[model samples]
Target: FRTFPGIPKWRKTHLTYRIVNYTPDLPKDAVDSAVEKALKVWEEVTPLTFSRLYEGEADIMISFAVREHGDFYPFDGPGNVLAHAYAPGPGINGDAHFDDDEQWTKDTTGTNLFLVAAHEIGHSLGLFHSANTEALMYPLYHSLTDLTRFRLSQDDINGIQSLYGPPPD
Candidate 1:
């Protein structure tokens, strides 16, 4: 993934997120776990730590919607534009939206929530699609099923650390 020059990132190491709504495709707990696991993809490498909030606004507000959801980019529905998110900043920044028109699931049979969440959250953290084809930040979504062995590519690590620095040793 690539980092935008002088882009706004979270000024602090700690962040909070909230699930504004749940997807009908899966159980609420399943969606919650997927979102949390996705957030951990960045947390494991950066100094950032994410906390979940049940009420009020959070650093990242997550929800599932179809078509226009108050954002400029309206989802194209199934087969294109699975989701989108904003870079870190004040209100609306760091928010992630999932396409409810698409089936979200835990396996490769459908759009994996964790995979989409991880990629969208990367945008929330200020990293853009990577030039490296194998990087998680790659704009194109690949069917990734090996959740048991998920790891960020070196390109992703370097790009993010450039903005946040390496995690504590």
Candidate 2:
């Protein structure tokens, strides 16, 4: 597990996010549910909380783009580089972008939106890729057959806890 330079974690426990747009591949409600579930992945382990915003800037701004978006990094068609996000901060620092070229799906088929979104949310919360392959922060993507039983690995828990401490008991 690792963190970005300065270990840029959110200064506060409460965070806000907004979906700038949706991909035609998935339904609008599916996208919304996926994003919410992704945020819940981290919320369960840490004190951090998230709320959705319809308008204006949010702590984490999510969007789907085909190629070069406004940022320096651009999507590479499909398969590799499913998505990316920035460390927590203002403006684009915590934004998450998904490559719409890839087939974004809700389950085991294609690239799992919930899994990728959860991983990207890890970065949005200031965690870098982890060396542990079982970790959610792992750079390489893999399909998990069961979504109902998904849980963060110890490495992921430690990484976020290091930044924001554990959830209240």
Top model number, TM-score: 2
Q: lDDT (0-100) at residue 130 of candidate 1?
A: 88
lDDT of each structure? 0.88, 0.91
lDDT of 2 by residue, 37-60 (tens): 999889999999989899999999
Q: Which ten residues in a row have the lowest lDDT in candidate 2?
A: 140-149
Which candidate comes out best when scored by lDDT? Answer: 2
Q: What is the Cα root-mean-square deviation between model 1 and the actual structure?
A: 1.3
Backbone clash pairs for candidate 1 read: none
